[PDB]
Write a sequence for this structure.
């Protein structure tokens, strides 16, 4: 039913700059969908886009909420810059980041091309400029450096107590050759690797970018033109190439898997892709002339990369009494992601038939170099009935899990005593004698789930996503370091493109 | 005598970047003068330039040494940017400062147009971080009636996030007058300014109205406000959104004034500086980030002919720094030099025509004169006195040559008397062997009346179309009432700027 999700909790979230002054939620949706349909030259689709958002089938990112339909607002907030080895290029890209930040953007940069310290200052030294800019202009920037870069040891110290860089997030780009030589017993590399694992234990960072997994499994067109993906974005799910004159940019939205059964046999995915192509077009037309957004503008025009994701994956499982671990979720992963990716692919081909291929995709038959990417969706999930975030399982059942509630009522046990016990057991229900192993397994939390199973599921999911997926792992501190190491290796070997924060 | 000044001490200085690899001092002068004559289309002037430099009548900025006559080297090292109140503009000027720094320039900026608090000082932090990153010295200027003035005065204090920026405050007449007449808020601010100069030496003082009421008529007619000065506070030129002031520097040696006063030395010095500026213009055509500097040079052709060995020249003639005779000497010499410089700039207009700004004004350069610190210049030329500053000491391991000669003719050029001078901190005021007149001649900076220094600087300023780096020596001893009166006298007598406050 329409607007089922709009309550006091979601209204509060939306009042933090999702809505213009004097605007109702319904009014905002109408503003946004009117604009999307105008950019497609198809005002008839307006009501279909409205229905999708009102029914909560598709959530839209916050920059879309706030900016789409306004005269000057930019409805994208995901940028990356390639940072050249010359001071003039660094200076230009510092500008890009400054202006990208100003308009509300999340930002990121690849620094692997920069000279090491003592050459005819170093890569880390220049990251201080970007650090200061973040402190100056509520911004977020992720710096990416290769693991076989000479300044890696310096790079890993970022966000330590004492370290002059406190504002930058970090990710490291780890190629296959480096990984194998480390397994085969390279002592230099193992000490670096132990430092990485040590850093991720302590601070949650850096993110891991598996360079060869990313480039192995990217759109054919990027292989044919030899455009390398060197790094990811702030949340580590975007997998696009940035160059001296092209800064990658992506529009995000998510399909709500909790309501999969409602929308799976409609044109929902198709309209989501049409919608995202519209958002991109609005960005493109609004940034013609903007000096510092030129490289972003130019990427958008040539690639038209889209990033349609998901949320409520755990919620969908729990709604169907499928446990997160085991074979049934894996096969269901294959069912849903084969279905969505296929439909997203066809939508992109349809877009090419109507609007034509952009310059990079001439002869390739599709409008968008990429269609799908799975973002964290922390806010969209909360907006949309406190659904599970992205493809991440719920941390807790009580911090009150809707599908656990209804189960407990069926058994009679929906009382304050049971919930008090759940609270004392940290949101777990694994202590409860009144639940079968099957029921316990469905309502296991992030902690209690096998991290190995999460990685295996990620691997299967990745085959249907042309970009990446924000993948958090919850590894206790008490869990041995040798076992953390096996978990990384498994992720790498099963084709996982990246790892996000490490929780504990 | 040619190359009298070249010895072990002056060769040590020249061997830190003045000479190219495998170059002799004679060869460098030749490269420089050849270049300067080429740029004028007057190769016959070359040997005149060589004679002036070899004889040590004219000293040349260090940037001229290393760069003039090379293919790509920029023979300017003095820049200033106007920082606009829009972030795109702040980003562009940050760019300017980064590139200006890269090519070996000292830099400065006016920040007074920036809005109050993330605020003016928040954005200075970017420039601070650039200094600590790029292979440098920057002076940030703010008006004293800027709301963020209190934050600004904390720069370079224990704990402050800004440690690399030098600072200067711009002080209007109305503010000084209201402060004197008993505005309590003003006095509170003035006290912090004085306390800061006492404990740190900073900030510099820029007397906005003094600077602007006594600037070239062309700047009044075009309504071009000089908002700030340079790193060393002697350069008095307007910067705008699209013009960034630069000036080429060199100095007349006043020690050898008797030698060159009746030659065409000053004229030739002006020709040389115009040539240097032409070399800068031609090498920066097409440089994106030096574009605003290139435009300033093209349109204004501002020059900065200075002086050095002022004190030395006095001591050579047994003239005391204090008293009417030094005051009259200031008038005789600087009237002569300023009149020759004005006429040479007129002759340049006759030969090469007027730049855009000076159509109808009948000269080639908006300004001709400015007095720099000349710390390195004076050390090179037989350790003569810097700029218009008194020697700090008679023995610091250099002996004052005119003192040495005065003692020489009293059989007092022995280790005993010099040991006595060293024990008295370079002073001869303890010596009953000298008359009172002779003691007056050899007073040191801290022993000279700071009032007399200011009064002399006031008289000098009437003959200098820009400014003059004016250090004061204020002991901690001295009462804040007396320090205050000193600042007011300087202001009242038309002093444009005060540089460092020294605390011997």
């Amino acid at each position: 039913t329409k607007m089922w999700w709009k309550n006091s909790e979601s209204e509060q979230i939306l009042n933090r700059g999702y809505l213009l002054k004097g605007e109702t939620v319904e009014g905002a949706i109408d503003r946004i969908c009117t604009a999307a349909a105008r950019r497609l030259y198809k005002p008839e689709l307006k009501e279909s886009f409205v229905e999708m958002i009102e029914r909560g089938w598709m959530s839209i990112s916050s920059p879309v909420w706030a900016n789409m339909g306004t005269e000057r607002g930019l409805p994208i907030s995901c940028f990356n810059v390639h940072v050249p080895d010359k001071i003039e290029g660094i200076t230009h890209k510092l500008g890009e980041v400054i202006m990208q930040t100003k308009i509300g953007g999340g930002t990121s940069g690849y620094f692997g091309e920069l000279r090491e310290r003592g050459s005819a200052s170093g890569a880390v030294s220049f990251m201080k400029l970007f650090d200061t800019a973040m402190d100056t202009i509520r911004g977020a920037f992720a710096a990416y450096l290769d693991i076989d870069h000479p300044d890696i040891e310096e790079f890993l110290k970022i966000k330590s107590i004492g370290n002059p860089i406190q504002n930058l997030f970090t990710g490291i780009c780890v190629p296959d050759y480096w990984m194998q030589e480390m397994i085969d017993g390279d002592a230099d590399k193992r000490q670096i690797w132990a430092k990485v694992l040590e850093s991720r234990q302590q601070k949650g960072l850096p993110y891991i970018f598996f360079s060869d997994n990313v480039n192995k499994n990217k759109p054919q067109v990027y292989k044919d033109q030899n455009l390398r993906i060197n790094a990811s974005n702030l949340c580590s799910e975007i997998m696009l190439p940035s160059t001296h004159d092209e800064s990658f940019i992506c529009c995000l939205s998510s399909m709500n898997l909790e309501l999969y059964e409602e929308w799976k046999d409609t044109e929902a995915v198709k309209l989501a892709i049409f919608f995202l192509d519209a958002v991109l077009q609005e960005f493109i037309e609004k940034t013609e002339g903007n000096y510092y957004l030129s490289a972003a503008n130019k990427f958008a025009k040539r690639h038209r990369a889209l990033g349609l994701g998901v949320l409520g994956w755990h919620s969908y499982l729990q709604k169907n009494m499928i446990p997160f671990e085991g074979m049934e979720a894996k096969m269901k992963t294959t069912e849903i992601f084969k279905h969505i990716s296929d439909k997203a692919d066809k939508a992109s081909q349809e877009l090419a038939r109507i609007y034509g291929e952009p310059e990079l995709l001439k002869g390739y038959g599709r409008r968008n170099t990429t269609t799908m990417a799975i973002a964290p969706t922390t806010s969209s999930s909360a907006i949309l009935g406190q659904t599970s975030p992205g493809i991440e399982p719920f941390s807790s059942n009580y911090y009150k899990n809707k599908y656990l509630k209804k189960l407990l009522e069926e058994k009679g046990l929906d009382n304050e005593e049971v919930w008090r016990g759940i609270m004392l057991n940290g949101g777990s229900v694994q202590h409860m004698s009144q639940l079968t192993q099957q029921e316990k397994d469905v309502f296991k939390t992030f902690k209690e789930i096998s991290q190995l199973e999460i990685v295996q599921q990620a691997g299967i999911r990745q085959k249907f996503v042309d970009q990446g997926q924000s993948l958090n792992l919850n590894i206790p501190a008490e869990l041995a370091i040798k076992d953390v190491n096996r978990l990384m290796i498994e992720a790498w070997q099963q084709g996982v493109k990246s790892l996000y924060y490490q929780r504990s």
User: Anything to note?
Assistant: The radius of gyration of chain A is 23 Å.
